[PDB]
Amino acid sequence: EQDGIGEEVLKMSTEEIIQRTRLLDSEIKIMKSEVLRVTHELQAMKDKIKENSEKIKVNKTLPYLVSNVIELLDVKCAVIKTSTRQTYFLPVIGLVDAEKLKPGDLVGVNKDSYLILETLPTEYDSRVKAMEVDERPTEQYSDIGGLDKQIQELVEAIVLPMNHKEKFENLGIQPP
Amino acid sequence: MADPRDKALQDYRKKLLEHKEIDGRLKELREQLKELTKQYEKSENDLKALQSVGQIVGEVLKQLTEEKFIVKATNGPRYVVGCRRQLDKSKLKPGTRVALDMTTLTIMRYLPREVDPLVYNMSHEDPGNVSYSEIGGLSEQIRELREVIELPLTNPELFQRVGIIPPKGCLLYGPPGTGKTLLARAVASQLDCNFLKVVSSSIVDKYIGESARLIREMFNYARDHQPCIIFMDEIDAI
Amino acid sequence: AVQKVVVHPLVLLSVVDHFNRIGKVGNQKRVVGVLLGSWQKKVLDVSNSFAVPFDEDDKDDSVWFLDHDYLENMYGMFKKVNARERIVGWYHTGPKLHKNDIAINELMKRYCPNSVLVIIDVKPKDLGLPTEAYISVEEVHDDGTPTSKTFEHVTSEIGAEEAEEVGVEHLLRDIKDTTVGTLSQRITNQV
Amino acid sequence: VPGFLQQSQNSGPGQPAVWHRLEELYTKKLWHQLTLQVLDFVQDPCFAQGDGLIKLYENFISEFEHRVNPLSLVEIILHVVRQMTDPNVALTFLEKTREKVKSSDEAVILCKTAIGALKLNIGDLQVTKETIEDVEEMLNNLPGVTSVHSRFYDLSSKYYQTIGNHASYYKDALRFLGCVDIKDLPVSEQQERAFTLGLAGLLGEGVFNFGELLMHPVLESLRNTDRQWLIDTLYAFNSGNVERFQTLKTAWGQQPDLAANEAQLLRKIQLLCLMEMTFTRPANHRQLTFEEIAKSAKITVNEVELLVMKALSVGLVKGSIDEVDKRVHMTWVQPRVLDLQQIKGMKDRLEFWCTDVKSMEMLVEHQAHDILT
Amino acid sequence: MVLESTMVCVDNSEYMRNGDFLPTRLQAQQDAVNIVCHSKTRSNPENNVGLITLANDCEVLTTLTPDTGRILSKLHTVQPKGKITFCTGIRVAHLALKHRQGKNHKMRIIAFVGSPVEDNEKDLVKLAKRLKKEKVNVDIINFGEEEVNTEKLTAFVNTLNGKDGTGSHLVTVPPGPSLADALISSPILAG
Amino acid sequence: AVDTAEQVYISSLALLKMLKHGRAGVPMEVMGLMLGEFVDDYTVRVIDVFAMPQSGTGVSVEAVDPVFQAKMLDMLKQTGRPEMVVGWYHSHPGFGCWLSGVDINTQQSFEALSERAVAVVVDPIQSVKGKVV
């Protein structure tokens, strides 16, 4: 703040109403020239990204096909094996990237273009599905008589690794 | 009007509160425009990626003449197709794998090998980032083991100066818990190129020839990739 | 840095289409439109084109007009129906060109950096004279002469891909001139 | 401020009719008829002693200026700071005027030339290669100023007073005479323009005359009155003859910078006469013997072979040398400019070529019409 | 409701950066373009407003289009650094009036002149008798500096619409403050 | 007041616009409209053939955009020549030529709106050796 006052004290009619006019005139005329320019460029690009997101949506049909990703190359390039025992290959994958996939995925495939566009959350055999038992009823520990030491030694073994995740990391050990 | 030291000291202070006010949101307007171009680039990358025909994967049986290539798809019939322009037909070895056009059926791009995503899972995993320091009392056995592995894959000139070919590998037998799987962490952390981990129990199947097909599929990845290590645990099963 | 162009036969007859369109009332004796392209690496290739209303006063030979809104509409339609084909330049007919072709080119270089023009010949078709092309160059002149434009020539050709020759061959059907000739076509080739 | 121009109204012939116009155009807030009138004042060939009075007015312009094209601002301040004649502060003054306008107008490019032309008097090694290179780096995307190349040519003539600058100087002298169109200065400086043009192309390593100077009247219409030795020695080189009289009378007439280069210019005409004496014979019996070169280039037998090894190493010819017949073969590959008298036979040998190719076409069409169809 | 083709003409010569007005003359001619295109639009939304320059080249920057959002973006950073060329500016504005997408509108040109003209009196009267044979009304409005009642402008405005013509008002701006009230009195409604 | 034997006059650039647009998207059933001129009762001509922007539906009446066509036709009135559509086209790469399930309906909609509206079928995968079907 001292440099703005000291240029008002020494000189009076050299750069008071000159320096504080010529660079402030040049600033606002650039700012007036760019406040409509960046805005008009903003609005036109919002239209072009709308027309494309419209055009991606119209070509987006619903009926898809499942397949299996075999590999991935770059000279980007991915090998598709469909569910009709048919193998395919593309130069470019599609709407999903190359670095978010892996071999063994059940991607949604266009029936004509054979384009990868969907993820399809990849279920498996029904046997471990039958092994999934949720909704465990809360059994009060006092139902157990006489075995309360083993209860604690279990709760010391598992529940505190579940709760105090960072107490076991700064100490220097690993929970069993 | 005139030239004071008070009014011309307050002349620009009512102005500097505007010229940075009009300038401050310009950086917000340029950054929003820059992200919008980044979003527009990805949309245009989606538009160009919308037109993809897809190429039929097939394999070259043999070469009939200088333009006639007997190829075959993975399940379909056999075709007689040719090449595009500069596809370097001398590389098209009878048994390579190519990508055929969907409609023209001719050869677009040749593909090196397959991966078989079953054995993809025996490739990608981290050992431990361990550094010969999470192991104790074994430096006689360790240095002897590192001697036969590291030296051919690093410095074969010593084996020239002797002449003698280096041998393949070692066996880590021992009563359990001694730390035998901990070494496979160590060699796959430092000087690692291609480290396969075979459990040697999951390679059996209900179909009669499938286990042998897995083994050759494991070794062709080993010839695909140069220097590579195949760790098979527990030979006692198989 | 253009080696050579290779436009299909689609715009070739077109211009003659548009020259046949204007000749009922037109007294311009030249047709100026907009060339489209697909610039691949170094060689150039044209598949499609279109025309645009253009007149030029013979007095003072420096007054021209181009409709850019019609250019901004119709090109955006073509990119919408076909997102492969883009602007590469322009074209006109008539061997004797008027001297506003520098003025046409310097304006629409705001569209295409390597802007390029193709001259066709609608009326001369008797001798051996295919299309002709130039390149947009800005130098002094040589060394010791005043500064100038000096339109440099780039060689041309008429390429022909698949799936149009069957449409070409089935439209010929008059002499058709089959390949390698039985000694009489080869002498005419040397004549 | 208006009293300052009334007290500085003097020092210029016929004061009030231009100073009343100066103060009125000052008050109409225009910037062009004022600037032409200030440019008219500085261009007035006087002693121009009012530099201290005009520097305060050029300061007074620049305070409320904020509108004018800075090109003519710096085009006149280079005339101002040259009239001040003070190189101690002229560099700091010019670097202040360069940094004060950094706008889209390419005025830095003529400031950097104004840096070098004022600095190339003393200590000319430290920034001089840099201040010449920064101009040619900044001569892009716009071949339309023609002053920046003019000021680039002016400093290169100031840089010509060095040890090694002779080949790039002559090519620069061709560019500036090309970019300029009008002459707008009398012959009494133009005669030394063409004279140092004649030396730098003669003291060129690979540039002997190169053509495109007999056609341009910028030398023959300006020196046909004085110094006829220089026009004649360019004629004997384009003719390619030795002509020992005329190539000596120039060695008498021009004493400096010709004594240490006389054996060089003998070497240049001995390599040059070949590629025209093989042009005198139209590729019929181009197997020429050593005797005719020894007669034409007046050189001995034991030096024609060192002569033609140099000429093949230059690259104006790619012929061979046979000594089982002692006849030198010539495949002349480097063309030049020629006059209309040698165009005449060249047009005839085109017509002879034309009337044979046509006549042979009549013979084929006559013979093979019946199986032409 | 009236159907015309409004072709505004601007000046970006070197004699525009004087700023005799209290604002910049560029800002004064910009708002002049603003209040006339707001006037032609609300009177009839079926017209079209398009800007044209004439200094050092008559570059058609905006096509004669009924949209105005493009023009409002093209009013900025015009870079007035050329020399005023007025003689071909009429002929290049008429050739824009001949290329129209609809041959139903009326033809009216307004012009902004902020620099003195240097042209022969023969040239303007050949152009004025050309506009009589073509039935075209052009308005001439002066900005900034102006020599009062010049012969070349007054004889042109007279010979443009002779024998009870339109009433093309020759606006003479004062070099004082002189805001847009001089331009919205007569000509905005009574052209 | 009935047909006898009509004759379609196609131009050289018409069929060239047919093959390139048909070859362009082969497995996506390209779809455009045919523009010509009814010169009399039983001869009909077509010189100018343009394409239509396709959709996810494919060859149907829904892929025919009305607001795009009238915007396109208006811009063709000033450049070249204005005329009226005389039919349509589509591509059947899967077989030869016959009017499909929805091709017959959009035929009825065109001959109820326009006069007779002849439908052209081009097989791009067949136009290979020296002939076109």
Ligand SMILES: Nc1ncnc2c1ncn2[C@@H]1O[C@H](COP(=O)(O)OP(=O)(O)OP(=O)(O)O)[C@@H](O)[C@H]1O
């Ligand atoms: N000698 C040792 N030094 C340091 N750590 C060891 C040692 N032996 C075992 N470990 C610990 O053992 C773990 C590795 O398992 P380990 O290799 O001992 O099982 P194993 O010996 O392979 O058992 P099995 O022989 O039954 O397969 C590591 O977490 C490591 O911390």
Ligand SMILES: [Zn+2]
């Ligand atoms: Zn159909």
